[PDB]
Design a protein around this ligand. Structure first.
Ligand SMILES: [Mg+2]
Ligand SMILES: [Mg+2]
Ligand SMILES: [Mg+2]
Ligand SMILES: [Mg+2]
Ligand SMILES: [Mg+2]
Ligand SMILES: [Mg+2]
Ligand SMILES: [Mg+2]
Ligand SMILES: [Mg+2]
Ligand SMILES: [Mg+2]
Ligand SMILES: [Mg+2]
Ligand SMILES: [Mg+2]
Ligand SMILES: [Mg+2]
Ligand SMILES: [Mg+2]
Ligand SMILES: [Mg+2]
Ligand SMILES: [Mg+2]
Ligand SMILES: [Mg+2]
Ligand SMILES: [Mg+2]
Ligand SMILES: [Mg+2]
Ligand SMILES: [Mg+2]
Ligand SMILES: [Mg+2]
Ligand SMILES: [Mg+2]
Ligand SMILES: [Mg+2]
Ligand SMILES: [Mg+2]
Ligand SMILES: [Mg+2]
Ligand SMILES: [Mg+2]
Ligand SMILES: [Mg+2]
Ligand SMILES: [Mg+2]
Ligand SMILES: [Mg+2]
Ligand SMILES: [Mg+2]
Ligand SMILES: [Mg+2]
Ligand SMILES: [Mg+2]
Ligand SMILES: [Mg+2]
Ligand SMILES: [Mg+2]
Ligand SMILES: [Mg+2]
Ligand SMILES: [Mg+2]
Ligand SMILES: [Mg+2]
Lengths: 122, 200, 32, 131, 180
RNA sequence: GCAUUC
RNA sequence: UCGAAGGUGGGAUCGGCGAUUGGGACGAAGUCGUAACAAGGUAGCCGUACCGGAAGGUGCGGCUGGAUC
RNA sequence: AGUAACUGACGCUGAGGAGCGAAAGCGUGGGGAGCGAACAGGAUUAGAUACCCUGGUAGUCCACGCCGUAAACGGUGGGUA
RNA sequence: GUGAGGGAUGACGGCCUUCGGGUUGUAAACCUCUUUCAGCACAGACGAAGCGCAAGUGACGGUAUGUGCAGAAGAAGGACCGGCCAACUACGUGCCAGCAGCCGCGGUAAUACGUAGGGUCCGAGCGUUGUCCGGAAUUACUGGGCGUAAAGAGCUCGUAGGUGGUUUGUCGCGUUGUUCGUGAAAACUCACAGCUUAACUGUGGGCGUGCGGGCGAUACGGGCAGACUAGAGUACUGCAG
RNA sequence: AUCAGCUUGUUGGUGGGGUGAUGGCCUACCAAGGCGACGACGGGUAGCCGGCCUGAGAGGGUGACCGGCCACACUGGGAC
């Protein structure tokens, strides 16, 4: 565009879609889970994926993935939710932190331990 | 912190002498581990990275402190590679090694850290202390007769002493007439790759 | 360009016009 | 309509230089004359003269091509232009091809090149780049 | 001694009734590090034969880079096949600040200090071509002086004359040490 | 003339 | 006299829920056709109008981003 | 286009705005040969709300309004060198 | 800081294997050497040309810091290892359990899953999530586009606005030079000094792009007063549709 | 602008009042003005700055500490 046009209207930057809106600008949000249930991934992949439906202190209902090989969680469990996109799942945007609040660290972990809330063996 | 693990495996990975007296390197000049023989795909990043590793694991400087050295060198008016090398050369543990009172840069660090040297009459136990023009470095009385230092007195000759350094006395007194220019510095490294690494 | 691009728009428009046909009287009664 | 006679002058020069024309005819203006004078002194053109036409004067610029037909002008750019006019302080004068080209700066002292302007410590309007 | 960089290996394929007939292409840059560089594109049924054909085509297309010192003369912008490369001269010590494809051209050209940015297509083949186009737009101050009819002190910046002088001194130094 | 699907 | 809070009144405006209802997106191996891509078996598409379970059909004007000659 | 008789930069473009704007469609009043959405039959087909055939109403035409869309295409804004 | 020097054809044990061995690895064991920082003793501040001049007065504080003693003595973890992107093999489940930032890895031979050995990058930290800038020339002033990729209004006329041919004089508004005032300190940056070094701190320049006042220039833009006919319009004589 | 008109102490004048001081600051009368696509009047959000973070720069984001202004002090009003 001509300079006159720029002077008249200007440049308008692309608006940024606010990601991870349900955290309300927090790094993590505490939540109580209503359902725990397995879910199917998108067509090329096939698995039973452990997922919880979590009511956050932000007053938003969210679906959260449960990372790790084995979980303790059931209804009314208190979990800490962080951001985390699981490509396979269609609507899932948040992951539950292992090792925080009611969620136990996954048993027999020896590598990547800090990401799964397992203490070092003595 | 310091790196206190095996010293040979570092020179072996980098393919160059760091201590320079190491028989186990010349016996096995290939990288360490099970796969140390195997063919490694070439990449410009690995070359740049390994020149940086040669610098910092020669002088014994952690990555945090080394990156501060880079920024100062780049800020300084000279060419960045020369400034970086002569800054690391200004380190007191390095000056002690270049003077000959130590066998290895590791030994030089321990001596300086344990409190055996004085600079312009004041005790300094900071290995990263950067000497300046006309600094005088001396040995405290207690450590002069100290058995490894006695060894150091009569073991003169291991390496040559650079022109900017000078040992003038049997007291093992070190004088610094100036900071070393790139020509004066003699190090098995291509400094231009480290400048490029930090420009990434 | 490819007629594919036109065909996508065609369908959306056609379905909208058909929706407007079916709801014409409803839209009048609910707009009053 | 005609809106920038100097841009027209530069493009007539550029197009003839591409076509390897020996001469360029222009409608005369005193500002075009002074620019042509600078181009002669800096060695980008061979010569220029003022002729008469039916209604006004004409500028004739003779282009300079070296042995083996090699263009003496590599590039010609209109910098200040109507509306978006460009002015430079004497300390911010533009460099053209790292200094191997010329910037033509209009000054209260007259038309000058970036070199002259910087020596005299004067700024002005940046008319064109030549390299 | 010739420095040879293989920039890209691309596995291409024709189709036939029996299936896909695969081939390999290699973009190879060859230079001496003294301001000669050539670019060769080789294609064959196997990777080593493709590289070998690339080397030969590069040597056929050697050209000379105007180098004031260990740096290019002046900033330049080369455009080719949607590829746009900006080259800017740098002070000594800066290093080759360039992207992958442009780095291979400039390292084999022996440029030690340069700033290079790619601003168009990211296709390695066309980035290399754009980089060559930029290097061909570089002009020597001697050639500017002659084409203008002016002396050298009149067409060039004093600081570029200075850097010229010192670089000539180092060439003389290497000639003294080498002939001694 | 007619000839849908995988 | 001015005057906070309070009372009364008719509107503005921003949302939440709502029997019922509209379309949209996605989902595994469901049902019905086969409209488009080859002249896709009636060249396709654009605007508009009427019609038909559905794709879509037909009229009028337009386009080639239409094959064969 | 020719002639330069005349004026003496009066030029260019134009946010908004105004006007014009194929065909279909809409309102009122005329007209209606041919053609022809819808609508009937016939044929084809598994079906045939189609293509093909026989008919056929709005419309196509006129007067005065409205509507303001088209692959309204050179898929290419206007002025000047 | 968690140690340093020496130390073999190279132990045990662990893990691969072409059963040759090869890795861990000079690593370890061992043999000497120095006790920084922690520990146990004994000295012990500056901050106070202060305050009261009555002669006493330091919260921090018996702290910081000196001088002795004992002995390697008390002191390493985290992530990653398909490509980007540095670092590969074996075993265990075989589209499962699971991984993942993107592309994508798991279907009884996986360098991508889990574990182990080995390796790499960082280190009293290492990773993850959230947030902003960068890469992104991907709102493009510097620095992009609109025949077919997203993009020329269906076509005109014209309002505000934007823009302006040749030439003389003048103003000095834009522009440009110079000087003065101001642009607090801190920050930033250059130098130099003080803390054992550094972080940090202090001193002196610069920076503070700006704005205001005085004075200078008049090429270019603009204002003002003129001139000109090549643009634009009119007249006259022909002409095609 | 998916916010186009808003304003009647409102715009201006004179005589009084008021204040430390100028002024519709207040008041009586008189004139019919004033502000708006160089976005008036609305709606949403927000203390501002020296600076900070990022960036080749231009720019983008931001205003914790430290330093300067402003605003408020359970909520609303008032004066002494
Ligand atoms: Mg540290
Ligand atoms: Mg691109
Ligand atoms: Mg079927
Ligand atoms: Mg409902
Ligand atoms: Mg079909
Ligand atoms: Mg068809
Ligand atoms: Mg058919
Ligand atoms: Mg078709
Ligand atoms: Mg029909
Ligand atoms: Mg038709
Ligand atoms: Mg107009
Ligand atoms: Mg318009
Ligand atoms: Mg009609
Ligand atoms: Mg009707
Ligand atoms: Mg009618
Ligand atoms: Mg009628
Ligand atoms: Mg019919
Ligand atoms: Mg009309
Ligand atoms: Mg349209
Ligand atoms: Mg048409
Ligand atoms: Mg169009
Ligand atoms: Mg045009
Ligand atoms: Mg790698
Ligand atoms: Mg940007
Ligand atoms: Mg981003
Ligand atoms: Mg683009
Ligand atoms: Mg265009
Ligand atoms: Mg398009
Ligand atoms: Mg058009
Ligand atoms: Mg106008
Ligand atoms: Mg003009
Ligand atoms: Mg004007
Ligand atoms: Mg300041
Ligand atoms: Mg009064
Ligand atoms: Mg607030
Ligand atoms: Mg940038």
């Amino acid at each position: 565009p001509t300079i006159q046009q720029l002077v008249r209207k200007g440049r308008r930057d692309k608006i940024a879609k606010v990601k991870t809106a349900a955290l309300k600008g927090s790094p993590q949000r505490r939540g109580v889970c209503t359902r725990v249930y397995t879910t199917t991934p998108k067509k090329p992949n096939s698995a039973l994926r452990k997922v919880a439906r979590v009511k956050l202190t932000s007053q938003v209902e969210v679906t959260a993935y449960i990372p790790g090989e084995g979980h303790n969680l059931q209804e009314h469990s208190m979990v800490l939710v962080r951001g985390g996109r699981v490509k396979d799942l269609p609507g899932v945007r948040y992951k539950i932190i292992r090792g925080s609040l009611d969620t136990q660290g996954v048993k027999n972990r020896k590598q990547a331990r800090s990401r799964y809330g397992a203490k070092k063996e003595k | 912190a310091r790196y206190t693990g095996p010293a040979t495996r570092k020179s072996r990975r980098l393919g160059v002498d760091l201590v320079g007296g190491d028989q186990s390197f010349e016996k096995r000049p290939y990288p360490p581990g099970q796969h140390g023989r195997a063919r490694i795909k070439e990449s410009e990043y690995r070359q740049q990275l390994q020149e940086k590793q040669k610098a910092r694991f020669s002088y014994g400087v952690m990555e945090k402190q080394f990156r501060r050295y880079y920024e100062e060198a780049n800020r300084q008016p000279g060419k960045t590679g020369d400034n970086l090398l002569r800054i690391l050369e200004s380190r007191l543990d390095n000056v002690v090694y270049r003077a000959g009172l130590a066998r290895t840069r590791r030994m030089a660090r321990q001596l300086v850290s344990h409190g055996h040297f004085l600079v312009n009459g004041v005790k300094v136990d900071i290995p990263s202390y950067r000497v300046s023009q006309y600094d005088i470095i001396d040995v405290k009385e207690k450590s002069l007769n100290t058995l490894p230092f006695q060894i150091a007195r009569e073991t003169a000759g291991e390496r040559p002493i650079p022109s900017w350094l000078q040992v003038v006395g049997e007291r093992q007194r070190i004088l610094v007439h100036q900071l070393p220019e790139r020509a004066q510095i003699d190090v098995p490294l291509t400094e231009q790759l480290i400048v490029e690494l930090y420009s990434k | 360009g490819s007629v594919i691009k036109k065909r996508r728009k065609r369908m959306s428009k056609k379905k909208h016009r058909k929706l407007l046909r079916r709801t014409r009287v409803q839209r009048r009664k609910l707009g009053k | 309509t005609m809106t920038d006679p100097i841009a027209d002058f530069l493009t007539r020069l550029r197009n003839a230089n591409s076509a390897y024309h020996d001469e360029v005819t222009l409608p005369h203006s005193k500002l075009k004359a002074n620019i042509a004078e600078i181009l002669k002194r800096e060695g980008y053109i061979s010569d220029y003269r003022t002729e008469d036409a039916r209604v006004g004067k004409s500028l004739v610029v003779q282009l300079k091509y070296g042995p083996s037909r090699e263009r003496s002008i590599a590039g010609l750019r209109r910098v200040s232009k109507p509306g978006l006019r460009v002015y430079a302080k004497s300390t911010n004068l533009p460099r053209v091809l790292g200094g191997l080209g010329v910037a033509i700066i209009s000054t209260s002292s007259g038309l000058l090149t970036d070199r002259q302007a910087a020596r005299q410590g004067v700024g002005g309007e940046v008319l064109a780049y030549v390299w | 001694n010739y420095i040879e960089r293989v920039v890209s290996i691309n596995r291409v394929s024709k189709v036939v009734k029996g299936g896909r007939r695969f081939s390999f292409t290699a973009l190879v840059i060859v230079g001496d590090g003294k301001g000669m560089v050539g670019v060769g594109y080789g294609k064959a049924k196997e990777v080593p034969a493709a590289i070998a054909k690339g080397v030969e085509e590069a040597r056929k297309n050697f050209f000379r880079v105007p180098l004031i010192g260990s740096t290019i003369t002046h900033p330049v912008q080369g455009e080719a096949a949607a590829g746009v490369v900006m080259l800017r001269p740098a002070s000594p010590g800066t290093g080759v600040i360039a992207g992958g494809a442009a780095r291979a051209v400039l390292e084999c050209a022996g440029v030690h200090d340069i700033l290079a940015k790619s601003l168009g297509s990211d296709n390695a083949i066309n980035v290399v071509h754009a980089t060559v186009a930029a290097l061909k737009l570089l002009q020597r101050p001697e050639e500017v002086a002659a084409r203008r009819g002016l002396p050298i002190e009149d067409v060039a910046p004093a600081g570029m004359l200075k850097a010229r002088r010192e670089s000539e001194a180092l060439a003389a130094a290497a000639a003294r040490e080498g002939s001694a």
